[PDB]
Design a binder for this molecule. Structure first.
Ligand SMILES: O=c1ccn([C@@H]2O[C@H](COP(=O)(O)OP(=O)(O)O)[C@@H](O)[C@H]2O)c(=O)[nH]1
Ligand SMILES: O=c1ccn([C@@H]2O[C@H](COP(=O)(O)OP(=O)(O)O)[C@@H](O)[C@H]2O)c(=O)[nH]1
Ligand SMILES: [Mg+2]
Ligand SMILES: [Mg+2]
Ligand SMILES: [Mg+2]
Ligand SMILES: [Mg+2]
Ligand SMILES: [Mg+2]
Lengths: 211, 214
C-alpha cells in the first residue's frame, strides 16, 4: 500500500522520466501528485483552504502552488487515515540503498507510533543559502562576490507522521498573511526544541536535490 | 589603521587565546571589543540607545548583549567616519588564505563605494542547522536518526560599509518592541529585497564558526 508521493507539475516530462527511472531501478513504488501551478484551480484551492496565503504578496504563485501541494498531501494523510506519508519533490536523486527505507515500512513502524508528531527528513541537511552571481564587481583571489537572494531549505524528501500532518495543517491554517513565507522557510523555522513537533534527520541522508 | 574587531566577553580566556593564535599566525591585526553581557552596563545601554529592545521578551539578555556589541561597533564606524569596519565573533576559525583578505583592505577599496549600503559576509553560508545525537531510537541500515534543530545564521564575520552602518543603526533604532528579531534575521534575511541594501557573500567563504565546522 503506497506511501511515496512525488510532487511534480503534470507537464514536467523530463523530471518525471528521471523520477520514473530512479524509483523503478530501485523497485520503489510511488505515485505522482500533480503539482498546483498558477491557475484557476490553485486560486480556488488557496481561497478555500488557505485564504491567508492567497493574499500574501510576498510569495510567487509558483511558491503558493508548491505550498498547496504539500498541504493537500498532508490533508490526504489525515483523510485517508494513513499512518505516515512520504513526500518528495520531482528533482530528487535517490541515494544507493534508498529502497531499504522507501519500499518497506516496518523499520518506521517499529521505531515510532504514528500519532507521535514528527517529520523524518530523508534529504541532505548541509544546504547553502541561495546566492546570485554578479558581474560588475570582479572576483578576488578566485573567490566570487555573490549576492544573497534567499534562505533556502529542502522540502524535497521527508516522512511525515499523521500526528505531524495534523499539527502542520493547523499551523499553516492559523498563520496570518504577514507571517506567510515560502513553505521551506516556514518548516525550517518550526525546527526548534520548545515544541511537540520533532524533526529527525537521517544521517547520512538517502537523497539529494539534483541542483 | 585597524579595521578588524573581534567581539569577545572580556573574561572569555580560552576563546581569546584561540583568536590571538589565529590572527597572529596569519599576521592579521585586530582588536578585541569587550562584549556586552547581562549586566548593569547592558541594561543601561539598552535603556539609553535601544529602549525598545530592553522590553523585547523574544531575545534573551545574552542575545541582546551580542546585538548591543554589533550595534556599538556600527556606532564606532559612524563616529570615527570609517569607510568600513570588519566584525568577527570570538569563535571563528580563519581559513587558509584569510590574510590576503583581512590584513589589507585595498581589494575592498578598489571594488566598492563605501557610501553604498552593503555588508559583505566572510563566513560560511550553509543554512544554520544543528544535529543532536540520540540513542533511544535505533539506527537503520547504518544511518543514524538525529534530532535536527534550526539555529540563528552566523554574524561571526562580515565587512560593513559606512552606508550600511548608518542604515542598520537607523533601522534598529526605529524597530518597535514587537518587530525586534535576532540580529542575523534583521541584517540578512529581512533586507533581501531592500532597495539599496545589499548583502554580498564571499564564495567560497574564508572563515567558519568553531561549531559550524563540526
Ligand atoms: O508552480 C509550481 C512550481 C513548482 N512546484 C513544485 O515545487 C517543487 C520544487 O520545484 P523546483 O525545484 O522547481 O523549485 P525550488 O527547489 O527551485 O524551490 C517541485 O516539486 C514542483 O513540482 C509547484 O507545486 N508549483
Ligand atoms: O552575553 C553575551 C554572550 C555572547 N556574546 C557574543 O556573541 C558572539 C557569538 O557567541 P556564540 O558563538 O556563543 O553564539 P552563536 O553563534 O550561537 O550566536 C560572541 O562574539 C560572544 O562574545 C555577547 O556579545 N554577549
Ligand atoms: Mg528543487
Ligand atoms: Mg523548495
Ligand atoms: Mg532563525
Ligand atoms: Mg549568532
Ligand atoms: Mg557562534
Amino acid at each position: 500500500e503506497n506511501k511515496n508521493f512525488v510532487i511534480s507539475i503534470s507537464t514536467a516530462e523530463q523530471r518525471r522520466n528521471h523520477i520514473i527511472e530512479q524509483f523503478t531501478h530501485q523497485n520503489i513504488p510511488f505515485e505522482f501528485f500533480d503539482a498546483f501551478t498558477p491557475s484557476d484551480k490553485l486560486t480556488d484551492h488557496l481561497q478555500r483552504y488557505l485564504p491567508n496565503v492567497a493574499n500574501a504578496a510576498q510569495l510567487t504563485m509558483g511558491e503558493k502552488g508548491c505550498l498547496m501541494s504539500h498541504f493537500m498531501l498532508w490533508k490526504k494523510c489525515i483523510d485517508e487515515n494513513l499512518d505516515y506519508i512520504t513526500l518528495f519533490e520531482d528533482d530528487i536523486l535517490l541515494g544507493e540503498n534508498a529502497n531499504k527505507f522507501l519500499a518497506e515500512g516496518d523499520w518506521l513502524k517499529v521505531r515510532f507510533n504514528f500519532q507521535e508528531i514528527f517529520v523524518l527528513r530523508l534529504e541532505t541537511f548541509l544546504m547553502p543559502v541561495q546566492l546570485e552571481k554578479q558581474t560588475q564587481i570582479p572576483p578576488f583571489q578566485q573567490r566570487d562576490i555573490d549576492i544573497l537572494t534567499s534562505m533556502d531549505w529542502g522540502t524535497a524528501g521527508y516522512v511525515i507522521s499523521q500526528g505531524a500532518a495534523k499539527y502542520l495543517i493547523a499551523l499553516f491554517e492559523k498563520l496570518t498573511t504577514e507571517e506567510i513565507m515560502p513553505i521551506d522557510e516556514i518548516m525550517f523555522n518550526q525546527q526548534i526544541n520548545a515544541t511537540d513537533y520533532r524533526v529527525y534527520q537521517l544521517n547520512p541522508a538517502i537523497c539529494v536535490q539534483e541542483l
